[PDB]
Symmetry: C2
Subunit: 140 residues, 2 copies
């Protein structure tokens, strides 16, 4: 399965390195996470430091604490168990959003969390870069 | 093991996604492949299709021949232009392998990525080659994207 992880990480890495548009990119990423990793009910939200710029959701109140303290929250069993993961999207020193998902497990959960956190960080950077480029267009 | 490849891939992708400029990017990437994967004397060369001149040329840390070539680079002269990975498991003339993976965007190959690896019985040279390809593909994409940004800039 650790091979499937690299494959997924690599695939999302390609999507990002070739496109500076998160609002089309994210859906592709969710698709990958859902098809390979087996996530579900994925959801992302990113707020402009001024305030809510981006929002996406998967197909088919705890997040609040991730904004406050900017640390990964997890609940191994909501009631095989269904876990709920919510990692912080943080770049520029602040937390700018949260990435969440469900993952039915039998399996190591802490690994899925470490992974979903890797995506959140990659996404955090792309968002920053997309805004930097928009800034150049604004000046001109 | 794969746990190291994941971290390394994650680290390089965390760089490519932070800036468009390749010249300040590649340096960090080479420093990772060297300290995590155990590569060395890595080199990246991207050409201009029309003039066949060098657009990008980055080399890692370490001793390079007085002439700038890597012994392996001189050997595999412009063979990368076929879009196929080249490898010489031994460069004798522990083993020292040389890997050269093609950088291809927009269909055409536009450069090469090379690295030397001190292999042994415990590590597979075939796996390292596959990994260097992933990096080559990511680098190609960023190069492509930096040009698209440079284009919309002139307009």
């Amino acid at each position: 399965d650790l091979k499937v992880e690299i494959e997924t990480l690599y695939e999302v890495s390609k999507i990002l390195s070739s496109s500076l548009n998160l609002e089309t990119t994210v859906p592709y990423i969710f698709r990958l996470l859902k098809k390979l990793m087996g996530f579900e009910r994925l959801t992302l939200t990113i707020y402009d430091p001024s305030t809510i710029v981006v929002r996406a959701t998967s197909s088919g109140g705890i997040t609040g604490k991730v904004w406050k303290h900017g640390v990964p929250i997890v609940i191994p069993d909501i009631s095989k168990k269904i876990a709920f993961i919510a990692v912080p999207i943080k770049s520029g020193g602040k937390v700018i959003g949260v990435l969440s998902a469900d993952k039915e497990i039998n399996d190591s959960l802490d690994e899925y969390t470490r992974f979903l956190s890797m995506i959140a960080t990659l996404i955090a950077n792309s968002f920053s870069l997309e805004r930097k480029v928009q800034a150049e267009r604004k000046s001109l």
